[PDB]
Amino acid sequence: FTGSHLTVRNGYSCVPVALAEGLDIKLNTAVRQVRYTASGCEVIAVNTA
DNA sequence: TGTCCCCCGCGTTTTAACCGCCAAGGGGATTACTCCCTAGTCTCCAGGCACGTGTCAGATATATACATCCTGTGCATGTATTGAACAGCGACGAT
Known part of the structure; x- marks a missing residue:
């Protein structure tokens, strides 16, 4: 991909938590x-607890 | 057009060409004499040419392979252009 390399300033976990909405x-x-x-x-499947 | 050098002109130095005169014998010119050689003449005939003929060396036509001549692709490399990723400076809000 083109452009510079960037990071997530506030943690990348904000994406999967938002994608899990609904x-x-x-x-x-x-x-x-x-x-x-x-x-x-x-x-x-079984329970991890 | 531009350069470098190869002759041209000229003064000074070196050589032998040229002329004048004598001395000599080598060889060419000239004559006299003899005979060997060639022109001229005749007779004899085969060597040389015209004529005819038969055929294969060579010209002609047609098919193929070889040579080459030149332009157009490729390559490679250097250079120019452009995009991107380093680098401000300042205003703002968050701490």
Whole structure:
């Protein structure tokens, strides 16, 4: 890309926190298995706590 | 047009050309004499030329490979141009 190199003066985490506005995110949820078949998918996940 | 040098002109130095006169024999010119050689003449015939003929060395036509002659691509390199990334200075608000 052209131009100079720039930084985020106030921490770059302001982007993903703003992008998460209005979404249905399941925090503290680790995925174990991922099942995929011809008629659908099934995701097995557990709680990190 | 521009340079460098190669002759031209001129004074002074060096050489032998030129003339005048004598001394000598080498060789060319001239004559007299003899015979060997060539022009002229005749007869004899084959060497040389015209004429005819047969054919292969060479000119002609047509197809291909070789040479070359010149212009147009490429390359490479240097240079010019432009964009970008270092560098102000000052006014403002936040601390």
